[PDB]
């Protein structure tokens with residue numbers, strides 16, 4: 164499941180990975196969700212790849228997450244920035260629609276996408292209410308390999324039944340889904356035996372995940388490599404806790 168050459172901190176911080184990405188547009192009339200764009204590596208010689216499904220926040224679309232497409236997928240992943248059914252979907256519905264996008268990748272995706280996909284190594288990512296929907300899709304399908312809630316928003320504060328390795332990225336100055344009442348109590352109610360981490364960004368707002376951010380990208384790549392690819396070549400950056408300057412607080416259940 165290991166793809167690409169051995170990583171240094173300069174390769175994870177790279178804006179482009181060792182693979183050339185291609186895309187495939189998915190209609191909004193696909194069952195269960197509002198469609199999106201499927202970013203996938205072109206070179207099929209290193210084998211098949213795992214996949215992640217990315218959800219945008221409340222009253223937002225995949226354009227708010229588009230920069231995760233070619234970025235992560237060039238490091239060796241299938242990335243699916245999806246649109247929801249309506250722009251007002253609650254976090255619970257964004258969980259379902261995250262799973263209907265993954266199922267679409269397995270059961271209905273184009274042949275070029277189907278051939279490069281390992282349908283057993285799947286994951287979810289999401290921003291704001293898409294991060295709450297990231298937490299729900301874990302509860303809804305415990306077979307998922309990774310879960311990455313970006314500045315997540317949810318009314319439910321306790322998430323002790325989650326079994327997926329979850330990486331909650333926080334934003335210091337977020338006042339829409341503030342970390343003290345959302346991102347932190349979400350992480351602390353995750354099971355202490357779960358492989359998990361909490362990264363809070365200094366001076367960041369609710370919308371920091373919507374523009375390219377080397378701090379966000381380098382450890383989303385490490386997290387998706389470690390748990391979707393079972394790639395222990397990326398534990399060096401996760402354990403012990405990263406000590407970057409753009410990070411104001413880091414918490415984790417290291418080592419893993």
Ligand SMILES: O=C(O)c1ccc(P(=O)(O)OCCOCc2ccccc2)cc1
Nearest residue numbers: 220221222223227291292316339340373
């Ligand atoms: O009180 C409420 O009604 C309420 C509703 C929704 C939220 P949420 O945290 O989901 O906001 C989504 C932010 O992301 C969407 C976005 C992405 C990129 C650019 C601009 C906007 C919080 C409170």
Ligand SMILES: [Ca+2]
Nearest residue numbers: 191192193196
């Ligand atoms: Ca639809």
